[PDB]
């Protein structure tokens, strides 16, 4: 299950991850709560991503 | 300042805005994370349609 970013968002900390429209993330832990920690398929970095800005493909 | 109410994956809770780290508004739903001093952090989601705009104006401010 890959998630694509609908809108771009710049991280405000090192907890959240910055991404752009069209970004593909590999959901690592979706059971963390509202914000899920995922690993980008493009950069390969880890961080929390807002579920409202992404959509499942 | 104020205590924001949210529904953490269904868990209705109210946490002080002063305990929030970052706020990400989508224009439909606001998602954020809070750090409680009681040794228990979490996340919070507030609907921009099913919640008072007064509190929404406190979540996402100019140059957030």
Pick the CATH number of A1-57 from 3.90.260.10, 2.30.30.40, 2.170.120.12, 2.30.30.90: 2.30.30.40
Question: What are the residues facing A54 on neighbouring strands?
Answer: A5
CA proximity to B47, closest of B35, B56, B39 = B56
> Which of A7, A32, A51 minimises the CB distance to B31?
A51
Question: What are the residues facing A5 on neighbouring strands?
Answer: A54
- What end-to-end distance do the CA atoms of chain B give, in Å? 17
DSSP string, B23-56: EEE-SSEEEEEE--TTT--EEEEEESSSS-HHHH
Q: Residue B22 — φ and ψ, nearest 5°?
A: -135, 150
Name the structure determination technique: NMR
Interface mutation target, options A35, A53, A55, chain B, most CBs of B under 10 Å: A35
């Amino acid at each position: 299950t890959l998630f694509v970013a609908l809108y771009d968002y710049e991280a405000r900390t090192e907890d959240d991850l910055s991404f752009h429209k069209g970004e593909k993330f590999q959901i690592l832990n979706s059971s963390e709560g509202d914000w899920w920690e995922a690993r980008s398929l493009t950069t390969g970095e880890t961080g929390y991503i807002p579920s409202n800005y992404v959509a499942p493909v | 300042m104020a205590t924001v109410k949210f529904k953490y994956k269904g868990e209705e809770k109210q946490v002080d805005i002063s305990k929030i780290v970052f706020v990400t508004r989508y224009g439909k739903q606001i998602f954020f994370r809070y750090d409680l001093g009681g040794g228990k952090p979490g996340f919070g989601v507030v609907s921009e349609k099913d919640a008072p705009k007064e509190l929404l104006q406190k979540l996402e401010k100019q140059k957030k």
